[PDB]
């Protein structure tokens, strides 16, 4: 792609190909700002009746997602036109946006939904979904326009366009018990469990209340919808932060959940509840072509192995998208798209079973990461992250590679490579933590590169980063750092075929003193065919001040 191959096309409102009579924001990297939080770090602000932005389809489309920002505590409309003819109205809302903190309390980002004295609003963008009754061809002018009766103002960030097939019917009424207006999901599952000839349940097109955790047990179960634009599982929207969805017991290992969407009612992060799917220790489960929003996470695996998450869309969550922890091995996380997660979009946390091993995180896109990293790997052995696209992180790297234990029981990285192979990272990095007494100080925070290689309190070894393009990172391309006083010696850290384009500070930073009490990096790293192009200050910082770290320039480096 790079990244996930999805049926929707993403088009930025601010593209020079798009006529507008509105106000195009100049880009910045500021959280809590309508430019800094936008995809591409820009949006088009429509602020008077008749203001519009005109997109042009590059593929046929009958369905649209508008990422936008409106005023706090408001709902309303904005209009959509095809070739100059009005065709409908998006339902735009800030119900799920606006999370409050202060510049020195970014640790609270996502947790606090109420405004207050001295508090700044963050997480300003949200989405509106709309299907039209015609497939419009590529080349159609799709205009988003603020007409009389629409919202007072709106920032238009991007438009998804998609040609959605008609809804898929029950695959076989004699094998899949249908949910219906008078038969709930739980009732259909009971009928399935008690009849050995059933393969599972079918959930038709429509909106279906999920007001509980729905338990899958008895045997492997198939849950099949009509397609994610059609089958909508809806948490009670007059409630907030209800822990609803599915919970897969061991007896239902081997289950499949596919072809549906789930619309949660979380308005802030809560730690504990809030994963759409629970499945501690689950095995052989497939989650495919589902679209989930407004949960804390899609899935947080705990010693969960041999599972497949494929073709999913994870948008606007309050913490991590998918995390696999504590022994989770041999999972296939393939061809998933995440936008707007509230912590690491796709993560692997290895802890004691010795390591999380054999996982394949492939063809993944993670953008508009509202806190933490697009991709994060904490220890492990023999895990692959391949064909990745990450962009527009608010506070942290595109890719975190860390051997910090966080106080848990872990051995760090193991004896087989953790591989990052094929990645494009656009406008990644950010500010987090504090930098009191730091070297190379530019603000009150620690400052994160597109890729952060952090030796923590556990072994940091066998890391291969290859075939990566890093475009316009906030600060740095590659950032290497060792936690003091542990000073774990980094071994077998290799970087190959990497382009670092226009970093504002340095192509590569060896962190010398992150904050008071911290020192430089230990071990070394090899660089082959690593190009640093147009750095703001210099290609590499910290080499002379890092006497315990050896930079090896194998060949092909312009620095």
Ligand X SMILES: OC[C@H]1O[C@H](O[C@@H]2[C@@H](O)[C@@H](O)O[C@H](CO)[C@H]2O)[C@H](O)[C@@H](O)[C@@H]1O
Instruction: Please select the residue that binds ligand X; options are 20, 42, 43, 93, rule is CB under 6 A.
Output: 93
Size of the site for ligand X (CB under 6 A): 19
Backbone phi, psi, residue 289, to 5°: 55, 45
Residue nearer to ligand X on the CB measure, 300 or 375: 300
Which CB, 325 or 335, lies closer to ligand X?
325
**Complex with Ca ion: residue 41 or 513, whichever CB lies closer:** 41
We find the least distance from the C-beta atom of residue 1 to ligand X, in angstroms, to be 27
Q: Look-up: residue for tokens 């394949």?
A: 360
Beta carbon nearer to Ca ion, 64 or 452: 64
Q: Which helix (H) or strand (E) holds 190?
A: helix 185-193
Q: What angle (nearest 5°) sits at the alpha carbon of residue 198, between those of residues 195 and 201?
A: 115
**Position of tokens 């004295």?**
117
Question: Could you tell me the smallest distance in angstroms from the CB atom of residue 39 to Ca ion?
Answer: 4
Considering the rule CB under 6 A, would residue 336 count as an interface residue with ligand X?
A: no
For residues 70 and 45, give the distance between their C-alpha atoms in angstroms, rounded to a whole number: 10
Sequence-ordered list of residues with C-beta below 8 angstroms from that of 171, at least 6 positions apart, any chain: 202, 224
Of residues 286-305, those binding ligand X (CB under 6 A): 296-297, 300
The annotated binding site for Ca(2+) is made up of: 12, 14, 39, 42, 157
Q: Which residue is nearest to Ca ion (CB)?
A: 40
Kindly give, in sequence order, each residue whose CB lies less than 8 Å from that of residue 356, ignoring residues fewer than 6 positions away.
324, 325, 326, 327, 328, 329, 348, 349, 350, 379, 380, 381, 383
Residues 87, 88, 93: CA angle, nearest 5 degrees = 150
- Residue from the set 84, 271, 544, 547 that interacts with ligand X by CB under 6 A: 271
Q: Does residue 251 sit in helix, strand or coil?
A: helix
Q: How far is the C-alpha of 399 from the C-alpha of 413, rounded, in Å?
A: 16
What contacts 190, CB < 8 A, 6 or more positions away? none
Closest distance to Ca ion from the beta carbon of 221 (Å): 40
Residues 490-529 that bind ligand X (CB under 6 A): 514
C-beta of 169 vs 436, nearer to ligand X: 436
Q: 433 touches which of ligand X, Ca ion, none (CB within 5 to 8 A by kind)?
A: ligand X
Query: Which does residue 300 bind out of ligand X, Ca ion, none, counting CB within 5 to 8 angstroms by kind?
Result: ligand X
Nearest to 234 by CA among 300, 180, 295, 311: 295
Q: Which stretch binds ligand X (CB under 6 A): 142-150, 269-277, 364-372, 389-397?
A: 269-277
Residues 113-142 that bind ligand X (CB under 6 A): 129-130
**DSSP characters for 206-237?**
EEEE--SEEEE-SS--EEEES-TTTEEEE--T
Q: What is the phi/psi pair of residue 227, to 5°? A: 125, 145
CA atoms within 13 A on the CB side of 38: 29
Q: Please name which of 532, 543, 482, 542 lies closest in space to residue 504, comparing C-alpha atoms.
A: 532
First to last CA, the chain: 29
**Residue 272 binds which entry of Ca ion, ligand X, none, with Cβ cut-offs from 5 to 8 Å by kind?**
ligand X
Out of 9, 62, 190, 237, name the contact with ligand X by CB under 6 A.
Answer: 237
Contact map string, positions 47 to 76, toward Ca ion, x by CB under 5 A = ------------------------------
Nearest CB to Ca ion, comparing residues 157 and 293: 157
Q: How far is the CB of 529 from ligand X (least distance, A)?
A: 29
Element (H, E) at 187: helix 185-193
The window from 8-16, 81-89, 490-498, 539-547 that contacts Ca ion (CB under 5 A) reads: 8-16
Question: 103-130: buried (b, 16+ CB within 10 Å) or exposed (e) per residue?
Answer: eeebebbbbbbeeeeeeebbbbbbbbbb
Question: Which one of residues 24, 95, 213, 219 is an interface residue with ligand X (CB under 6 A)?
Answer: 95
Which residues in the 148-187 window bind Ca ion by CB under 5 A? 157-158
Residue 319 binding: pick among ligand X, Ca ion, none (C-beta 5-8 Å cut-off by kind): ligand X
Footprint on residues 398-417 left by ligand X (CB under 6 A): 404, 406
Q: Which stretch binds ligand X (CB under 6 A): 19-27, 241-249, 266-274, 308-316?
A: 266-274
Shortest distance in whole angstroms from residue 78 CB to ligand X: 12
| 114: DSSP letter | S
Q: How far is the CB of 422 from ligand X (least distance, A)?
A: 27
State the residues that interact with Ca ion by CB under 5 A: 12, 38-40, 157-158
State the residues that interact with ligand X by CB under 6 A: 91, 93, 95, 129-130, 237, 269, 271-272, 296-297, 300, 319, 325, 404, 406, 433, 446, 514
């Amino acid at each position: 792609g790079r990244g996930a191959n999805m049926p929707f096309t993403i088009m930025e409102a601010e593209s020079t190909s798009n006529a507008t009579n509105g106000t195009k924001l100049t880009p910045n990297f500021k959280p809590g700002d309508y430019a800094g939080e936008a995809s591409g770090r820009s949006s088009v602000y429509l602020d008077a009746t008749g203001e519009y932005v005109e997109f042009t389809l590059t593929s046929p489309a009958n369905a649209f997602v508008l990422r936008n920002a409106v005023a706090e505590n408001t709902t309303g409309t904005v209009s959509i036109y095809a070739d100059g003819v009005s065709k409908g109205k998006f339902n735009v809302s800030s119900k799920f946006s606006y999370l409050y903190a202060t510049p020195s309390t970014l640790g609270r980002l996502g947790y606090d939904n109420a405004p207050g004295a001295g508090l700044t609003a963050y997480w300003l963008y949200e989405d509106a979904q709309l299907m039209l009754d015609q497939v419009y061809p590529a080349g159609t002018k799709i205009k988003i326009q603020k007409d009389a009766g629409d919202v007072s103002w709106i920032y238009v960030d991007l438009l998804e366009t998609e040609n959605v097939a008609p809804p898929q019917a029950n695959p076989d009424p004699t094998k899949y018990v249908a949910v219906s207006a008078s038969k709930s999901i739980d009732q259909a599952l009971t009928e399935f469990r008690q009849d050995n000839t059933k393969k599972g349940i079918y959930i038709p097109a429509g909106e279906w209340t999920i007001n509980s955790k729905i338990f899958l047990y008895g045997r492997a179960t198939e849950i099949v919808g009509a397609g994610p634009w059609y089958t909508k599982l809806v948490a009670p929207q007059s409630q907030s932060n209800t822990d609803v969805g599915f919970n897969i017991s061991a007896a239902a290992n081997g289950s499949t959940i596919r072809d549906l969407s789930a619309w949660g009612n979380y308005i802030n992060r809560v730690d504990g509840p809030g994963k759409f799917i629970d499945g501690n220790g689950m095995q052989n489960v497939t989650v495919q072509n589902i679209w989930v929003e407004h949960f804390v996470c899609l899935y947080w695996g705990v010693n969960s192995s041999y599972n497949t998450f494929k073709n999913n869309r994870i948008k606007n969550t309050f913490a991590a998208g998918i995390n696999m922890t504590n022994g989770s091995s041999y999972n296939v996380i393939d061809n998933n798209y995440a936008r707007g997660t509230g912590d690491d979009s796709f993560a692997l946390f290895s802890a004691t079973g010795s390591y999380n091993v054999g996982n394949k995180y492939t063809n993944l896109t993670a953008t508009n990461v509202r806190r933490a990293a697009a991709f994060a790997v904490y220890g492990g052995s023999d895990n692959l992250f391949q064909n990745l696209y990450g962009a527009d992180t608010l506070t942290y790297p595109g890719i975190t590679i860390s051997s910090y234990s966080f106080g848990y029981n872990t051995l760090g990285f193991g004896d087989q490579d953790t591989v990052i192979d094929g990645a494009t990272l656009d406008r990644t990095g950010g500010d987090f933590w504090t930098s009191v007494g730091a070297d190379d100080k530019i603000n009150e925070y620690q400052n994160f590169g597109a890729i952060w290689i952090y030796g923590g309190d556990r072994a940091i070894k066998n890391i291969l980063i290859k075939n990566v393009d890093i475009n316009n990172p906030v600060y740095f391309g590659l950032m290497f750092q060792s936690m003091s006083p542990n000073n774990m010696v980094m071994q077998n850290i290799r970087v190959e075929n990497v382009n670092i384009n226009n970093p504002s500070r340095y192509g590569i930073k060896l962190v010398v003193r992150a904050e008071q009490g911290q020192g430089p990096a230990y071990g070394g790293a090899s660089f082959t065919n690593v190009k640093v192009n147009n750095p703001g200050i210099s290609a590499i910082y910290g080499e002379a001040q890092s006497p315990n770290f050896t930079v090896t320039r194998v060949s092909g480096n312009n620095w």
